[PDB]
Write a protein that holds these residues in place. Sequence first.
Motif, PDB file in Angstrom:
ATOM      1  N   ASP A 503      33.347  37.937  37.301  1.00 44.13           N
ATOM      2  CA  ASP A 503      34.388  37.568  36.351  1.00 44.13           C
ATOM      3  C   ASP A 503      33.886  37.828  34.935  1.00 44.13           C
ATOM      4  O   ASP A 503      32.855  37.288  34.526  1.00 44.13           O
ATOM      5  CB  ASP A 503      34.785  36.105  36.532  1.00 44.13           C
ATOM      6  CG  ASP A 503      36.154  35.798  35.960  1.00 44.13           C
ATOM      7  OD1 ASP A 503      36.394  36.133  34.782  1.00 44.13           O
ATOM      8  OD2 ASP A 503      36.991  35.226  36.689  1.00 44.13           O
ATOM      9  N   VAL A 504      34.625  38.654  34.192  1.00 46.56           N
ATOM     10  CA  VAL A 504      34.225  39.042  32.840  1.00 46.56           C
ATOM     11  C   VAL A 504      34.027  37.818  31.955  1.00 46.56           C
ATOM     12  O   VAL A 504      33.086  37.762  31.151  1.00 46.56           O
ATOM     13  CB  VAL A 504      35.253  40.024  32.239  1.00 46.56           C
ATOM     14  CG1 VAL A 504      35.240  39.960  30.717  1.00 46.56           C
ATOM     15  CG2 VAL A 504      34.967  41.436  32.715  1.00 46.56           C
ATOM     16  N   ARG A 505      34.909  36.819  32.077  1.00 42.25           N
ATOM     17  CA  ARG A 505      34.731  35.595  31.303  1.00 42.25           C
ATOM     18  C   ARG A 505      33.421  34.893  31.640  1.00 42.25           C
ATOM     19  O   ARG A 505      32.831  34.236  30.774  1.00 42.25           O
ATOM     20  CB  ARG A 505      35.883  34.617  31.553  1.00 42.25           C
ATOM     21  CG  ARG A 505      37.256  35.036  31.053  1.00 42.25           C
ATOM     22  CD  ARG A 505      38.150  35.364  32.239  1.00 42.25           C
ATOM     23  NE  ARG A 505      38.716  34.137  32.800  1.00 42.25           N
ATOM     24  CZ  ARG A 505      39.205  34.014  34.030  1.00 42.25           C
ATOM     25  NH1 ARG A 505      39.190  35.045  34.865  1.00 42.25           N
ATOM     26  NH2 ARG A 505      39.697  32.851  34.435  1.00 42.25           N
ATOM     27  N   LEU A 507      30.482  36.377  32.694  1.00 47.42           N
ATOM     28  CA  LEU A 507      29.353  37.100  32.115  1.00 47.42           C
ATOM     29  C   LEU A 507      29.186  36.769  30.640  1.00 47.42           C
ATOM     30  O   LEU A 507      28.060  36.698  30.133  1.00 47.42           O
ATOM     31  CB  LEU A 507      29.532  38.605  32.309  1.00 47.42           C
ATOM     32  CG  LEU A 507      29.921  39.048  33.718  1.00 47.42           C
ATOM     33  CD1 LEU A 507      30.156  40.549  33.768  1.00 47.42           C
ATOM     34  CD2 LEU A 507      28.830  38.644  34.686  1.00 47.42           C
TER      35      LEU A 507
END
Lengths: 543, 543
Positions: A503-505, A507
Motif C-alpha cells: 500500500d503506497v500510503r 510505504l
Amino acid sequence: EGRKAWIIGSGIAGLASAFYLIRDGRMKGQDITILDAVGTPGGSLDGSGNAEDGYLIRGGREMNWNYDHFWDLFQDIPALEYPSPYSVLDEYRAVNDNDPNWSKSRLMHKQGQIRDFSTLGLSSAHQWELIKLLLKRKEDLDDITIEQYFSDSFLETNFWYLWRSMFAFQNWQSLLEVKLYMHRFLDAIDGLTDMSALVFPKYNQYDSFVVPLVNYLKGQGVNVEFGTRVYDLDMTDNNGERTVTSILAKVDGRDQKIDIGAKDVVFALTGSMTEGTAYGDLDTAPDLSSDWALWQNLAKKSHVFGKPEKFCGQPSRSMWESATLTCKPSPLTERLKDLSINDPYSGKTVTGGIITFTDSNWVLSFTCNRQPHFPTQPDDVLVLWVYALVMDSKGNHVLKPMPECTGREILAELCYHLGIVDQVDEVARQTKVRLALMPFITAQFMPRAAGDRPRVVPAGCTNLALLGQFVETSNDIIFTMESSVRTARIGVYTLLGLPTQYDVRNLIKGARALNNNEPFMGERLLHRLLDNTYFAHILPPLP
Amino acid sequence: EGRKAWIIGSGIAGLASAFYLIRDGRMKGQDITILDAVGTPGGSLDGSGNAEDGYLIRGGREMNWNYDHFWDLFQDIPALEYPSPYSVLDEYRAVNDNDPNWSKSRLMHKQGQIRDFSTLGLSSAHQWELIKLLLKRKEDLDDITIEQYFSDSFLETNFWYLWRSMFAFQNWQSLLEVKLYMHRFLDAIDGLTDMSALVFPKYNQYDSFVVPLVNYLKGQGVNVEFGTRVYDLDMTDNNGERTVTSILAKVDGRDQKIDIGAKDVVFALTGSMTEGTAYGDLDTAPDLSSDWALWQNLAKKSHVFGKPEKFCGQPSRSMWESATLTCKPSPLTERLKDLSINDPYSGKTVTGGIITFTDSNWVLSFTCNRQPHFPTQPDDVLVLWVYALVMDSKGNHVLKPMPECTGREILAELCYHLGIVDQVDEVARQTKVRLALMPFITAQFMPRAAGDRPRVVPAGCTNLALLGQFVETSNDIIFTMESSVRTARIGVYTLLGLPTQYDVRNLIKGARALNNNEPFMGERLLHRLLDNTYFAHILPPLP
C-alpha cells in the motif's frame, strides 16, 4: 463425513481447531476429542497461581494487536461476565475502546529517568539496512542471525531496544522474523514507540479469552482426555501420500493405542516452550518421552517434517527467566504511580505495556497490566510481570547472573533501575515474587533454514495438520496467540474446504517513521508532484 | 427501539434496506413496510414479458462483477431451485465457477468481421490523458463532459468503444464517472476487453436474485403496500437538524397521510430511470406528480437535497432505446453460432456479454446471455437483448433514425452489421421484437457539480436516508445493483450504528494494460532493480 476429530494439545491452537471444525466444518462436538496431558486442573501442579502464594504468570509474553483472526473467532463466543447475546469480542472492545493503551515510560535508564522514545532513533545507514533487509529474498537468509546481519551501532538504537523487548528476542536468533515483521507492520511501525497498536483484555488471555472459549466448547459437546501425552503416530506412506493410522499415547503411565479411520482428521501441537521450567522464588532458586517426542519421531519418518534439533538443540540460547510479583502497597508501587498512564488501582491501563531498562546488563523489562490481572485478586494487591533477556551477565547493582540470583535479589536490580535502591527492604517483605526459568521460551525464534519447519499440512498428508509456533506458513510466529489461531484455521480449512505492505500510503507511513518523523528522501519531491492532485492525502504534512 | 421502518420504492435498493434492518439492525419484519406504486403484479401493466408476445427486458444494462456487497448480502438468502441450507450465492457461484464468462466477438465491424480487441488501443497521449485524469481533483471537474476533456482521437480507441458500450454512456455525460471507474478498477482494466471480471446469474437479476430476496422477506413478515406513489415528505427543521414527520402519498388516486414518530426511519429511492418509456414493437412504433415529485419537493426544502433538474432537464440527452428479441431458429441464430463461446442452446454462456458494432452509426450493441434467460421459456426460443446509443443518426443500411425506426427495421441494421443482410425476411417473421424507448435511462450519468446530489444521509437528517443512483457517496453509480446495495447499507448503518488503487501491484497491472501489454515506461528499470529481490513477483514478465 460422519467422521471424528482428534486434537493433540490443550491450548489456544487446539481449542481454535475445534471451533473451526464446528462452525465451518459443520461437524458436531460429539466427534471432537482433545488429548491433554494435564493432571486435572490445579492443585499440586498448580493451575495458574494462588492469591496467597504470590501468583505465577504462565510464561510468557502475551500481547495483542487488532488483527482479523481474533474478530472472526471471538465474535461467536458468549461473553465472560455479560449476558446474552454479548460476546467476548464485545467485552474486549468495551473495556479497551474506552481506555486505549499507550505508554509513558517505555524506555528508562540512568536509574530512574525515561530515555526519549519519541522516535526509532535510526541514523541513515540503519534505515538503509532495514530497507535492504526488506528487499532480500527469503531463500538467501538461511541461518543468518540478528547480530550477523545488522551493524553494531544498530543494536543500540531505540528501534532494537523496543523490538527485542516487545518480542523477547535474542541477538543470536532468526533474522527472518525481523524481516517478516517489517513486511507486515510497515503501516504501524510508529506504534513500536507509543504502544498504540497494542490492545489488551480485561484480565489475562486465559481468563478473558480461552475460558469463554472452553465453556463454549463444552456447551457444544467436545470430549476431553486429560493425562494423555502423545509421543508418536504410526502412518502409512503409499504413493508418496501419507495418512495417520494410530495415535500412540501414554495415558496415566501406561501405553494406549487410539485407532484412526481414513475419514478422521488429526491436529497436533508439535513443540514445547515451557518444558524444563524451574519454579524458584524469593529465597530458594531455580535448578534445572517429552513434549518434543511427537515431533522427533515425526522427523524420523520424513524430511517434510523438518529438523526439531535445530530449535531444541541449545537450551542456553532459547532461555530467559520471568518473575511474577505480588505487591501490597510499598515504595515500589509509590514509585510506580510516577510512571503510569493512570493510577495502578484505577482499573484502567497503568504502565501501558512493558517498561525496558536500556542500560541494564540483563536487558530487564517489566509490565503492570490493567489491574486487576486475575479475577480473584484483592484491591490492595497488584500483579506485576518482570522478565529479562541476558542470562550471562552481572547486574548493574546485584553483581550476580540472573539465573543464579533469585527473588529478593531480583527486587534490588529492579529497584536500582527504578531509582529506589535505598528502599529495597520495605518492598522486599511486602511483595511476593515467584520466578520461572524457561529453557525453550524462545526455541521458535532460533535460526532456521528452508525446510526446517513443516507446513500446516506437509506435502502428501491427507488427515494430519500441525499447529503452533514451529510450522511454516507465510507469516511470523512472534505473536503467539495470533499464530496459533492462524495455523488452526489453515489446518481445518485445508483438510476440508475453503496485502498491507504494497500500500503506497503505508510505504510513506513507514519511510517517515524510519526517518524519525522528519521528511525522508523523496518526500519533498513527492509533495511538489502531488500537493495539487487527487493524491494529496497520501502524504503527511511537513513542518 | 420499538420503532417501525418505511421503505419508499420497490427495487433492489429497497429490499436490501429491509434486509439490513432485519439482520444487523435487529428489528423485526413486522415493523417494516415497503411502499410500492405497482398495480399488483403483471396483467395489463405487464409484469416482465409474456412468452407468447415476445418478452420485454426491464431496461436496462444489468451486469455484475465480483464485489463484496453481493457476497455479504446473498449469503443468507435461501436458494432459488436448491434445498436448504443452500443459498442464492451458492447457486450464483455454482453455475458460474463452472462456465466462466469471456467474450469471443466483443467488437465487430465491416458487416460481419471482428475488430481486434486484444488491447485497449491507446497510443501514448491517450495513456497520458487517463493518467492526467486520475491525478485531477474531484473539486476541479464540475460539469466537465467526456468529449470536452478527452481528445477526438481518444473517442475512437478500442477503450472508448468498450467503455461506452459496457455502461451505455454518452459522450456528453459526466467525466467524474470515468474517473471514478479508473480509481476503482485499475487492477482489472484489462478485463474490459475479454469480459473476465463479469459474472452473471443463471436467469435474470430479477428471477435469480431479487425473487429469492423477496420470498425471504415475506418469510420474515415485512409489509407491502402497492398502489402507493409518494410525492412529498413534511419535515421539521429545528436547530439546523431535520426529521421526517409524515409521508404524503396518493394511494389508488386519493390522498393519504402516514404519520411517522420520532423513533421511526424512512428510506426513499429518489429518481426514476424508466419514466416516459414508450413500448412499441415490430410494426407500430414508440411515441412519447411523477416519480421525480418526491425529490423535486425535497429540493425546495433545502440545498442539501441537490438539483434534480440537472438530471431530468434534457430528456434527449438521457435517452436510448432497447429491444428484446425472441427468436425461433433462423439464419440470425445460425450466424450467432459462429460468434459464440459455446452453443446458444447449450445452457452455458454464449456471446459472453455484449457485442458492439463499432462502425454502426447508432453505436449498436447486442447480447445473448446464458440461455435460457427466463425460467418459463422453451428450448426452441432464445432471448437476445439489443440497444443503441445514438438516437440522432441514420443507420448504415436503414437510413432512419432509430427512435423513428421500429421492429423489423431494427432487424435490418442488426442483420446488416452481422453479415446476413440478404436473409432478413427469414429472420423477420421468426423473431418477435418488443422495443423500449426510455427517456431517463442515463439521467444519473448527466453532468453534475458538487452538491448536485444529496448524500445517503444529508447533513442534519436524523431519520431519512436516500437510495439509488442519484445520491453522493464516494463511489460510482455505473453499476446499478451494486450502487443500490451500497447506498442501502450506508443508510441502515448510519441512522443506526456501524483501497485497491494504492496497491503497487495494481498500478503495474494498470500501466501495462494502458500500454497494450507491452512494457511501459519505467518497467525496464523496475525489472533491473527488483528481479533479484523479494518484490520480483509484483512485475509481469517481458517478451
